[PDB]
């Protein structure tokens, strides 16, 4: 705080302000198609000969 001889008026002190930030999200769309070509052949845990 400023030093002032006790006759004179005084000193005035400045101040500060604000800031802002904004954001927007991004959009994600993965997918799969399923044929009969993917369903039919053998999933690995299945016995030989007859599925």
């Amino acid at each position: 705080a400023p030093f002032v001889a006790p006759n004179v008026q005084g000193r005035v002190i400045k101040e500060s302000g604000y800031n802002t930030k904004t954001f927007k999200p991004a959009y994600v769309k993965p997918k799969h198609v399923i044929d009969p070509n993917m369903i039919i052949p053998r999933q690995p845990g299945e016995a030989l000969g007859t599925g």
Binding site: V4, A5, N7, V8
Partner: protein, 63 residues
């Protein structure tokens, strides 16, 4: 030839200081005639007011 800017009075000192130090002083008011420290060739009352015909600072008389 040309009057130096030391020859235009502005303030009245409030507390003493040396050169290199800074001084609080008065810029406006109504002041005593005799408490202020003038110098020579500026003795009478009329010249002391003609120093400050224009400013905020006016130099009056006590009763």
């Amino acid at each position: 030839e040309v009057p130096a800017p030391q020859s235009v009075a502005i303030g009245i000192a409030a507390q003493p200081a040396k050169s290199g130090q800074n001084v609080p002083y008065y810029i406006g008011g109504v002041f005593n005639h005799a408490a202020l420290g003038w110098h020579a060739s500026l003795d009478t009352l009329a010249k002391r007011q003609a120093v400050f015909d224009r400013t905020n600072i006016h130099i009056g008389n006590l009763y």
